[PDB]
Protein: Distal tube protein
Amino acid sequence: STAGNAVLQMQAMQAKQADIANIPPQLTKMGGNTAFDYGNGYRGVYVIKKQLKAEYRRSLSSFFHKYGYKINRVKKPNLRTRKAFNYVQTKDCFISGDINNNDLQEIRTIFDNGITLWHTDNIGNYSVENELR
Amino acid sequence: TKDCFISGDINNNDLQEIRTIFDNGITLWHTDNIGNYSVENELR
Amino acid sequence: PLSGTNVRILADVPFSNDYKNTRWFTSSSNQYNWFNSKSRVYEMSKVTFMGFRENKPYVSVSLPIDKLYSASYIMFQNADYGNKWFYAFVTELEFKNSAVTYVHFEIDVLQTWMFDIKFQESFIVREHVKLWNDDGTPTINTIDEGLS
Amino acid sequence: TFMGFRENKPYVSVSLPIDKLYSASYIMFQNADYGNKWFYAFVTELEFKN
Structure:
């Protein structure tokens, strides 16, 4: 019931079923008629900025907010970057220090299993902004 | 069935077992020749 | 909970230790009034719970195993939590002699602490959502169910 | 004097009944031999003696 596999199942339940192509199937028919294009004011280049639907923004934003981004690189973990909380999950992490190797081995597994580190006494209140600094 | 709901005047322990029985699948016979699948088994 | 007051053993409570279903109430009062409405199999003004050891906790009920079949639930108060009602499942019946019976229980963490919990922002797999806008137009729900 | 003598479960002997210890969540203590280090521990479970 570790926080890590909890997140993994969450990744699985909202798993990307398909990418959005954004190639109009009517591209083929667009040119050919110059009188049609210039008549209706089609001319030069157009810059069309597209962004995902609001429904999925809420979804993904909420997810990212609680459990951060996927990282997949080896470094020392961000433990105190945000104002409120930092989620941290590692794999085969290395933690040293003057502690009996039994306890030290347990701490390693704690971060290997994933953990949220709070910096404000209002623990569990995920409604905050949790910005940097 | 899957996550079936069966109610009635029975202790919740037994009732919970019956639910699992149908959740696991079962053949209910209506003729005394049990296991004889060679019949037509039509409606009515 | 060591001791108990105003104890009632309850029948006709449908939900069980599966915690797949339970009855949800609006107020501490509404909770009690619902539970109050059952056909009372047994009552006691004070009870010393004595199961305390290995863990099976229990009560000593002075009626034979017969007539005690209907037993489904227990609600009781404690001196230390004031007039807070504690709600518990009837897990098991065990042989005492043939005239008074042992009724063992399991505190319902849902029913008991129901109004004492605060739910915070959590990932939710499924829930019942608002279906229709005011206009009669359908609310937008496009999450891929993955169903044929 | 802590007496969770068995390797895998340690405890303390608290001279107040079990009903009053439900709220118990955590334990903090120092040791004479490790100076002023504070030790922090979860209250895993309550067990009835008398």
